[PDB]
Copies of this chain bind each other. A is one copy, B any other.
Amino acid sequence: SMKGEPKVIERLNEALLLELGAVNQYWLHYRLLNDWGYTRLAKKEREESIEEMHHADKLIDRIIFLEGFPNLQTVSPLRIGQNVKEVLEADLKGEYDARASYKESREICDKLGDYVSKQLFDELLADEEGHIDFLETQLDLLAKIGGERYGQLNAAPADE
């Protein structure tokens, strides 16, 4: 039998809650950024949302294989920025929360002997550190050239 560990399912569900939160956060940021004129940042944000959708699908699939029930009924609390730098910082804070949850989860899976699930958390963890490297670089850039120049760089002219 393939019935998984209850503590393992719990961690996948906890990870799923964060991923659904991040999907919604990134998508709302995409629409707000677009409304503010920052069409190029907006596009990156849409892609980040779609990437997290793919993660959530992977977690769902692993939960059902372990004969657990995935919880899509509730969403982890959203951080909504009100200008460009706040959007980047709200996202980064979310990715650190995610990193820390995935770090704890791979250790729990490891101790309980569920090594395929550990491997899933390890892949999520390397992902989030990817997103974290990206966001921290953008924020350094914003700080070195200033918000208004970072805004201009990430906006399109009116004929696009």
Contacts and interface: CB of A to CB of B under 8 A. Distances in A.
A146 B147 CA distance: 11
Nearest to A148: B145
Interface in A25-70: 25, 27-28, 31-32, 34-38, 40-41, 43-44, 47, 57, 60-61, 64-65, 70
Interface of A: 2, 20, 24-25, 27-28, 31-32, 34-38, 40-41, 43-44, 47, 57, 60-61, 64-65, 70, 72-75, 77-78, 83, 103, 106, 113, 115-116, 119, 122, 125-126, 129, 132-133, 136-138, 140-141, 144-146, 148-155, 157-159
Nearest to A88: B158
Top 4 A-B pairs, shortest CB-CB distance: A37-B141, A40-B157, A24-B72, A44-B158
B153 A138 contact: no
Nearest to A24: B72
A72 B76 CA distance: 10
A25 B70 CA distance: 11
A115 B119 contact: no
A157 B72 contact: no
Contacts of A40: 157-159
A25 B35 CA distance: 25
Given A119-B122, A119-B126, A64 B35 contact: yes
A64 B125 contact: no
B133 A126 contact: no
B125 A103 contact: no
A72 B31 CA distance: 12
